[PDB]
Amino acid sequence: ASSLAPRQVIRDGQFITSPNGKYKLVMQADGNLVLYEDGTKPIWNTTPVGPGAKAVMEFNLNLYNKAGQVAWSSNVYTAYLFEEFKDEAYLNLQDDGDFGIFSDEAKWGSIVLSRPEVGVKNKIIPTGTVMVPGTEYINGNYRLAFQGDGNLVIYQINPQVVIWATYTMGADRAVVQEDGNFVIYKGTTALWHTHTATGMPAYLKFTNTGKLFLSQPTLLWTLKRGSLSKPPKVIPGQHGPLDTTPIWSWPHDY
Ligand SMILES: OC[C@H]1O[C@@H](O)[C@@H](O)[C@@H](O)[C@@H]1O
Ligand SMILES: OC[C@H]1O[C@@H](O)[C@@H](O)[C@@H](O)[C@@H]1O
Ligand SMILES: OC[C@H]1O[C@@H](O)[C@@H](O)[C@@H](O)[C@@H]1O
Ligand SMILES: OC[C@H]1O[C@@H](O)[C@@H](O)[C@@H](O)[C@@H]1O
Ligand SMILES: OC[C@H]1O[C@@H](O)[C@@H](O)[C@@H](O)[C@@H]1O
C-alpha cells in the first residue's frame, strides 16, 4: 500500500510505503508520525503525542492524540471544507519521499446525480487502461463489460438487466487516456467519448450501484510543496490489485 483511502485510519505501527520501497510513512505506537528512508533514517516527523494516537485521512491528514484532539494536520488550504470532501480525498506517498493529498471532482458520469450516493464503493480503473473485447469488471451486483460487438455495457448481474450502454457497435478498444478523456475507438476513429480532454489524466470509477464516473487528479497539497492553488500535472504511478486509490507521481521542480 502506497496510499491512504478516504477515512482510512492508521495507528500503532501501521504504515504505507512508496512504490519503489525506499520511503515508509508510519504512525508509531508512541504517537509519532514518521517518514523513514531505507527503513533506518527518519527524515521527517510530527514528533510524538503519546500512546493511543492515530492518524486519519479525512480531507486533511490529521493526527489525533488519545484525548481526541488534533495534534498535527496537513492543514490544506481550501476555502470551503465540505464534509462530503472527507469521503473523497486520498493520499499518495511517492518514490522521492514526498507525499500528497488529492481531492478529485467528477468530470463525467453515466448518469447525472441529485446528490452523492452514501457508502458507495468504487472500483478504480486507472489511467492507460485499454479495454478490449471480453474485458469486464464486477463490483457487487453490477458488471461493466467491453463486448465483442464493441458495446460498452453496465449490467445488473442478478437479475440480468441492462443499466447503461454506449451503443458503440464495431469498436475495438476503449481507452482511459492521459489527456483526461475516455474514448472508444474503431481503429483511429472515435465512436464515442466523454468530452473530458483537459491535459490531466483520467481514471474511471465503476460503482457497486451500477454507475460509471470519470475523474481527474487534483493535487491539493504535499509535504514538500505545501498547499497548491493550481493543480500540477501528475503522472500515473503503478496501479495493481493491492491499491484502493489512484496512484500518482508529481515532478521535483516546475
Ligand atoms: O456528464 C453527463 C452526461 O453528458 C452527456 O453529454 C453524455 O455524454 C452522457 O454520456 C453523460 O451521462
Ligand atoms: O481488474 C480486473 C479484475 O479486477 C477485479 O477486482 C474485479 O473487478 C474483476 O471483475 C476484474 O476483472
Ligand atoms: O441494450 C444493450 C444491449 O445492446 C445490444 O446491442 C448488445 O450490445 C447487447 O449485448 C447489449 O446487452
Ligand atoms: O459522438 C460523441 C458521443 O459523446 C457522448 O458522450 C454522447 O454525447 C454521445 O451521445 C455521442 O455519441
Ligand atoms: O474527440 C475524440 C478525441 O478527442 C481528442 O481531443 C483526444 O482526446 C483524442 O484522443 C480523442 O480521440
Numbering used by the authors: 2 to 255
Question: What does the paper behind this entry write?
Answer:
Here we report on the discovery of a novel member of this family, pyocin L1 from P. aeruginosa, and show that it utilises lipopolysaccharide (LPS) as a surface receptor, specifically targeting the common polysaccharide antigen (CPA) that is a conserved homopolymer of d-rhamnose. Alignment of the pyocin L1 protein sequence with other lectin-like bacteriocins, LlpA1Pf-5, LlpAPss642, putidacin L1 (LlpABW), LlpAAu1504 from Burkholderia cenocepacia and LlpAXcm761 from Xanthomonas citri pv. malvacearum shows that pyocin L1 contains tandem MMBL domains with three conserved QxDxNxVxY MMBL sugar-binding motifs. Pyocin L1, as predicted by sequence homology to MMBL proteins, consists of two tandem β-prism domains characteristic of MMBLs, connected by antiparallel strands propagating from the end of each MMBL domain and lending a strand to the reciprocal β-prism. In this work we have shown that pyocin L1 targets susceptible cells through binding to the CPA component of LPS and that primary recognition of CPA occurs through binding of d-rhamnose at the conserved QxDxNxVxY sugar binding motifs of the C-terminal lectin domain.
